[PDB]
Design a protein around this ligand. Structure first.
Ligand SMILES: *[C@@H]1O[C@H](CO)[C@@H](O)[C@H](O)[C@H]1NC(C)=O
Ligand SMILES: *[C@@H]1O[C@H](CO)[C@@H](O)[C@H](O)[C@H]1NC(C)=O
Ligand SMILES: *[C@@H]1O[C@H](CO)[C@@H](O)[C@H](O)[C@H]1NC(C)=O
Ligand SMILES: [Gd+3]
Length: 432
């Protein structure tokens, strides 16, 4: 697709800190851009919609190539349409915003320039941020994560995409998402199946796969840390059912690991570690600092800070594993005790180190879950199991509280605020 300018595109600014092993941090001035799927897609020379509700125009978009020639992405009114604001080093993402249409959440990328995403090399480095999850009930996910996207949004590889990173093109993740309207500079109208439960979304014939480091998927009840390897490290189109992920009949049927090697303290039996109020170690009614280190072995270390008090990731005992580091032993013990083979079949922490040794793009988002109702994060899951099934209980939420119709009507002013991003060598993000 191309870009149109019926609405001007002004990327909300966002500062962050780049830290050095020399004992200092220096402020960077970046900006954020909303993903192209959230934008108005219309004809290049009129206000006629290419996509509206959850169907495409038959005349403008008869096939994937024709649609991309005929259609453009427009600008975003960040605050009034999407409930997205920034304030210095802080980014606020709102949940439901009713304007002319219903908007639900947003997915945003950190930019390095008007036309490029900021790339981070995570291996041997650490990433720190602060987060307020107090306004995120059961069913929501305020996510901060990294994906192996191209820095330019795909423009150099797929020159039929001229909108680029300036308009939030190029998304991929370990779910091989098929709900994307544009992939590889073509539309995704071929095979488009409107969602029966969502008047604004559907599933197309193609998807967009890549490695995903979920630093933070969380709400006020539960939080999880999860690397997802893929057999191709970076962005790759997939076809139909071959995609696997959330949007295919068989989630395990593709090139990416949709489950990952996850560490959720509640799931591991530490049920007083993270939650709302004074009975929890980390009180989710207040802002929290989350620090994540990518050790050179491929292991991942985690600690937290709240009200000036530091807490390491709590220890877990799982089978023969005892410790508090997300490492090979943990991920092996997790598959043994809880089940699954997708993480190890996709190459585990060794294949994952290929992603973190390269560049990844920072993503911040808020979403509800029309497919699994976030029960994997904060409830008992899978829902054919019981509390006695090892690893089934991940939080205290009810089965039905994360149904989108419920959370969108009950908690429309839910929101997440991410702030004070700092990045640098291991041990450097506490620097002034
Ligand atoms: C708008 O652009 C299309 C090509 O995408 C062109 O075929 C169409 O006729 C144009 N509209 C006019 C001339 O009104
Ligand atoms: C949970 O973690 C905290 C570590 O901050 C600790 O004080 C508490 O003993 C742990 N509870 C468990 C392992 O059940
Ligand atoms: C739950 O369903 C999964 C697959 O959908 C199956 O592997 C498992 O055996 C089922 N367990 C029970 C207890 O029904
Ligand atoms: Gd260590």
């Amino acid at each position: 697709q191309s870009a149109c300018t019926l609405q001007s595109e002004t990327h909300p600014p966002l500062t962050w800190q780049k830290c050095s092993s020399g004992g200092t941090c220096t402020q960077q001035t970046g900006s954020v851009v909303i993903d192209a799927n959230w934008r108005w897609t219309h004809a290049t020379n009129s206000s006629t919609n290419c996509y509206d509700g959850n169907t495409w125009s038959s005349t403008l978009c008869p096939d994937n190539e024709t649609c991309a020639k005929n259609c453009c992405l427009d600008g975003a009114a960040y605050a009034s349409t999407y409930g997205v604001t920034t304030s210095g080093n802080s980014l606020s993402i709102g949940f439901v915003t009713q304007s002319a249409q219903k908007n639900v959440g947003a997915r945003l990328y950190l930019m390095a320039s008007d036309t490029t995403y900021q790339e981070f090399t995570l291996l041997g480095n650490e990433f720190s941020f602060d987060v307020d999850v107090s306004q995120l009930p059961c069913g929501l996910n305020g996510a901060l994560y990294f994906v192996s996207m191209d820095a330019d949004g795909g423009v150099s590889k797929y020159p039929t995409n001229t909108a680029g990173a300036k308009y939030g093109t190029g998304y991929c993740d370990s779910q091989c998402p098929r709900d994307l309207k544009f992939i590889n500079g073509q539309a995704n109208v071929e095979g488009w199946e409107p969602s029966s439960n969502n008047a604004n979304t559907g599933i197309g014939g193609h998807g967009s796969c890549c490695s995903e480091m979920d630093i933070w998927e969380a709400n006020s009840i539960s939080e999880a840390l999860t690397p997802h390897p893929c057999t191709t490290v970076g962005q790759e189109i997939c076809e139909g059912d071959g995609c696997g992920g959330t949007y295919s009949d068989n989630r395990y049927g593709g090139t990416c690991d949709p489950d990952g090697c996850d560490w959720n303290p509640y799931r591991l039996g530490n049920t007083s570690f993270y939650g709302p109020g004074s009975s929890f170690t980390l009180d989710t009614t207040k802002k929290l600092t989350v620090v994540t280190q990518f050790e050179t072995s491929g292991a991942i270390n985690r600690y937290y800070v709240q009200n000036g008090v530091t807490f390491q990731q709590p220890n877990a005992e799982l089978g023969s594993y005892s410790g508090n580091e997300l490492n090979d032993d943990y991920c092996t013990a997790e598959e043994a005790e809880f089940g699954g083979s997708s993480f190890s079949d996709k190459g585990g922490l060794t294949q994952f180190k290929k992603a973190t040794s390269g560049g990844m793009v920072l993503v911040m988002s808020l979403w509800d879950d029309y497919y699994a109702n976030m029960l994997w994060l904060d409830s008992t899951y899978p829902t054919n199991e019981t509390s006695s099934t090892p690893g089934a209980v991940r939080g205290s939420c009810s089965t039905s509280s994360g149904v989108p119709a419920q959370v969108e009507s009950q908690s429309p002013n839910a929101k997440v605020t991410f702030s004070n991003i700092k990045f640098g060598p291991i041990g450097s993000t506490g620097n002034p």
